[PDB]
Amino acid sequence: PNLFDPLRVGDLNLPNRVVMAPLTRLRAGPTHIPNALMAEYYGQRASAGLLITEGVPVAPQGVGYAGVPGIWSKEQTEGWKQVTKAVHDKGGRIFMQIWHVGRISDPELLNGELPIAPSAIAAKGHVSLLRPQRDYPTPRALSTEEVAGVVEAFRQGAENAQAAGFDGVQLHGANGYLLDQFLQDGSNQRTDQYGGSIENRARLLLEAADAAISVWGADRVGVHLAPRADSHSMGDSNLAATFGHVAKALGERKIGFVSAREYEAADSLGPDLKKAFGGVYIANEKFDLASANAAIEAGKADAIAFGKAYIANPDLVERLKAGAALNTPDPATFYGFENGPRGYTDYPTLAQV
Numbered sequence: 173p174n175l176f177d178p179l180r181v182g183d184l185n186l187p188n189r190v191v192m193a194p195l196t197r198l199r200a201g202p203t204h205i206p207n208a209l210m211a212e213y214y215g216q217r218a219s220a221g222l223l224i225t226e227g228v229p230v231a232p233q234g235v236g237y238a239g240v241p242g243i244w245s246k247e248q249t250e251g252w253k254q255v256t257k258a259v260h261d262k263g264g265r266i267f268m269q270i271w272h273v274g275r276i277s278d279p280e281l282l283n284g285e286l287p288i289a290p291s292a293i294a295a296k297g298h299v300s301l302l303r304p305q306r307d308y309p310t311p312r313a314l315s316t317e318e319v320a321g322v323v324e325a326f327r328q329g330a331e332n333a334q335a336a337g338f339d340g341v342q343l344h345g346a347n348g349y350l351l352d353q354f355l356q357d358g359s360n361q362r363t364d365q366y367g368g369s370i371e372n373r374a375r376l377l378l379e380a381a382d383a384a385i386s387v388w389g390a391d392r393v394g395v396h397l398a399p400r401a402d403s404h405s406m407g408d409s410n411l412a413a414t415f416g417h418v419a420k421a422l423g424e425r426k427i428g429f430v431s432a433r434e435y436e437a438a439d440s441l442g443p444d445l446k447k448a449f450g451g452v453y454i455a456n457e458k459f460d461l462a463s464a465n466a467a468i469e470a471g472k473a474d475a476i477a478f479g480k481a482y483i484a485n486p487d488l489v490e491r492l493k494a495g496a497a498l499n500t501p502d503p504a505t506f507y508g509f510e511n512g513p514r515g516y517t518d519y520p521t522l523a524q525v
């Protein structure tokens with residue numbers, strides 16, 4: 173197949189294999205309530221085979237950025253209904269990315285509380301976007317019973333996404349956030365049932381996945397991974413065995429899809445993870461029209477998610493079909509509530525009259 177061929181993914185027939193990657197934009201602002209501009213933004217992109225939302229924290233403890241939307245409250249759930257209505261009114265399909273940042277945050281975003289983690293080990297470098305610039309804090313290690321609290325927050329988030337009219341949920345198991353912190357032996361030095369073997373390190377991700385499956389059915393659950401461990405101070409002494417284990421466990425659960433942020437190189441685990449998973453595999457990171465087509469024709473991926481191209485190109489599917497020029501993304505308006513429509517809902521389409 174090629175990028176334009178349909179694909180069945182769980183209980184959905186995608187009309188094409190162009191996916192919108194999850195993209196944090198912070199256009200909700202300090203109430204965390206989704207708004208009509210966010211609804212318009214996803215509706216603009218509804219020609220996608222599948223849309224994935226921006227990461228959505230399942231609890232205030234999972235907030236890493238000012239202006240993120242939430243999925244923990246009824247008022248947030250009501251606000252998301254506008255977004256799913258907008259997408260469904262344009263005949264699109266959308267999953268919510270459900271999220272907990274763990275140690276990748278700052279007490280000023282958590283009402284003075286420490287971010288939480290499997291282990292009291294700070295991420296390297298500075299908190300993104302916050303001024304003045306400051307290092308990540310040493311996080312607070314969860315008790316064993318507080319890990320069950322995290323799973324419950326994921327379950328309730330999966331429930332609220334369902335009440336908000338989503339077609340499914342994708343777990344943010346990627347980019348050094350909480351599930352990835354638990355998964356990798358660089359960040360997880362626990363000695364309870366959540367540390368000290370690949371089985372134990374994968375347990376939180378797989379419990380969160382099982383919570384989502386109980387709400388949605390396996391067909392309406394995806395899991396997002398970053399097997400190169402190249403963002404937010406990640407690292408594991410055997411990435412092939414760690415990610416292989418996750419892929420095989422999710423495959424035994426027959427979930428809708430695995431997605432991965434992982435650019436193509438000789439060291440890519442994607443083809444091995446796709447094989448171990450046995451289901452739909454959505455690749456991502458630095459793909460273009462030709463490399464997307466070549467990867468799908470080679471059976472290396474079933475579909476391709478685009479991040480920065482979908483920021484700048486609401487009609488990306490039509491532009492890729494036409495081999496038309498792409499709008500250049502403006503990184504200065506990727507993030508920030510203040511921006512409103514600017515660099516959000518105002519990128520041009522090919523249409524003129």
Ligand SMILES: Cc1cc2nc3c(=O)[nH]c(=O)nc-3n(C[C@H](O)[C@H](O)[C@H](O)COP(=O)(O)O)c2cc1C
Nearest residue numbers: 193194195196226227433457458459478479480506
């Ligand atoms: C502004 C911006 C925000 C992002 N927010 C998220 C996020 O919320 N969840 C996530 O899993 N990845 C997030 N990513 C990563 C993208 O999903 C994607 O993996 C990355 O942009 C690489 O794909 P690309 O080369 O097509 O852009 C974000 C990337 C950008 C540029």
